[PDB]
From Swiss-Prot, chain B:
Residues of the full protein shown: 166 to 458 of 460
Organism whose genome encodes this protein: Homo sapiens
Name of the protein in its database record: Interleukin-1 receptor-associated kinase 4
Ligand binding (ATP): 27-35, 48, 137-140, 153
Gene (UniProt): IRAK4
Protein task: Serine/threonine-protein kinase that plays a critical role in initiating innate immune response against foreign pathogens. Involved in Toll-like receptor (TLR) and IL-1R signaling pathways. Is rapidly recruited by MYD88 to the receptor-signaling complex upon TLR activation to form the Myddosome together with IRAK2. Phosphorylates initially IRAK1, thus stimulating the kinase activity and intensive autophosphorylation of IRAK1. Phosphorylates E3 ubiquitin ligases Pellino proteins (PELI1, PELI2 and PELI3) to promote pellino-mediated polyubiquitination of IRAK1.
Keywords carried by this UniProt record: Acetylation, ATP-binding, Cytoplasm, Disease variant, Immunity, Innate immunity, Kinase, Magnesium, Nucleotide-binding, Phosphoprotein, Serine/threonine-protein kinase, Transferase
Co-factor(s): Mg(2+)
């Protein structure tokens, strides 16, 4: 679908730069532009106005055209601007950290979100795309807390342009390779966030990278039990250990030793 | 020791920016400056003129005053009118010698082993004095007239720019630690074995450290990669050094040996 630039301008209050916290329309910065909350028809939408180009714009639509799935953020249209289905519950990162005082997600709900995110990655890989920025801040949650993968801004093959969020990036990705195996790795870090409720990096924490508690648990210096988010009351040890096992396998340093997204799906389905 | 800026200017030919190989005095660019060949007082010297602070100029002179060792490049003095003066290493870098730059003969296997040892010693001295080098690579390993190894020059969405070829994964993430120095040294051992450069944009694989995966997966053997420009490499000792290299190149920083263990394994090897 195609929107008028006039409409977008106004339904977002001329791109009001103030945070929604204050009553403005500014929802975030990312995906190479700024994201404003807007109202089209009687439905709320997310409006990205591009900033640091046109290649990025055409490319983002080309990838959106092939990839629509239940667990991916649906591109509604365009206008220079882009328009998405609005997800009222924000990022998985926000919810895990209970930002703004929202209630901690239950284990059952966390499990659903992990299955959802994985089905949406499985759809990307089936259709031969790579996301390259799988991280909890890019997993959105709609009104039902369905996982919706977002910010397709970055979606043997090498690249001179190495990019991603380094706390989530696989070692071959860090070196510049481009392969679906790296998405799996990043998803491993996302699972660790879900199990623990801890951010992927914490300057003031030992270890600073969440992905490093994997070694701590292998060397038996720690246990999964030690790291399980305490902000829930329904997380039985069997299914928690089941999900940690998946995370562990995603986090293998040798890309070929990693599960493909489909056995990731199978393992999280078996989890419940 | 301390120098005159103009005597330094004089003996470097007005700091002739042209490279040595066409008759200038520029040897390289590094350590936040340009390095020139100079001569004075019956001493050939290397001069690094800092370019765009003085705390840092005085901060290295601290580091250098402490760290004097047979396998570290020695600081001879300084000028503040900004220049650091070093001992000149007439056989240039390990990289140059591995690549037989300018027609120089290949280094034998036996010599390569000595150099590997010498570098591990210099790295050991650094880590014992709680120093992270951050830039172990074969172009930073100089060779003196006797081919003694002299070590020298010591998270939202983003893109990396750092020279991936030598850097460990945790270092690319931003961690700063001596276990990274070890990983880089592993790449250097692979250079010593293969004669190959760490990265080659027109090679499969581009990064040298990837042959470790090729070998583990039994798609290749370390023999297939042995520098053919040697006639004294016995497979037993080569396989020994390769094993040291493989361990340094461990993907998780805590499974790698510390520099003391690298010294031992390298010693047993001869």
């Amino acid at each position: 679908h195609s929107f008028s630039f006039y409409e977008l301008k106004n339904v977002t209050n001329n791109f009001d730069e103030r945070p929604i916290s204050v009553g403005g329309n500014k929802m975030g910065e990312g995906g190479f532009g700024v994201v404003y909350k807007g109202y089209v028809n009687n439905t709320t939408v997310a409006v990205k106005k591009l900033a640091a180009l046109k290649q990025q714009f055409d490319q983002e639509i080309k990838v959106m055209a092939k990839c629509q799935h239940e667990n991916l953020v649906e591109l509604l249209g365009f206008s220079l601007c882009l328009v998405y289905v609005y997800m009222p519950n924000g990022s998985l990162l926000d919810r895990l950290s209970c930002l703004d005082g929202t209630p901690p997600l239950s284990w059952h709900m966390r499990c659903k979100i992990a299955q959802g995110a994985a089905n949406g990655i499985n759809f990307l890989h089936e259709n031969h795309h790579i996301h390259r920025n799988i991280k909890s801040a890019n997993i959105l949650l709609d009104e039902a807390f369905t996982a919706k993968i977002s910010d397709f801004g970055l979606a043997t093959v090498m690249t001179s342009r190495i990019v991603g969020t380094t706390a989530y990036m696989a070692p071959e990705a860090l070196r510049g390779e481009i392969t679906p195996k790296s998405d799996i790795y990043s998803f491993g870090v996302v699972l660790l966030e879900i199990i623990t409720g801890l951010p992927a990096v914490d300057e003031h924490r030992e270890p600073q990278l969440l992905l490093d508690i994997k070694e701590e648990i292998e060397d038996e210096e720690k246990t999964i039990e030690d790291y399980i988010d305490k902000k829930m009351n329904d997380a039985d040890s069997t299914s928690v250990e089941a999900m940690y096992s998946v995370a562990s396998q995603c986090l293998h340093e040798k890309k070929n030793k990693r599960p493909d997204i489909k056995k990731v799906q199978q393992l999280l389905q078996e989890m419940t």
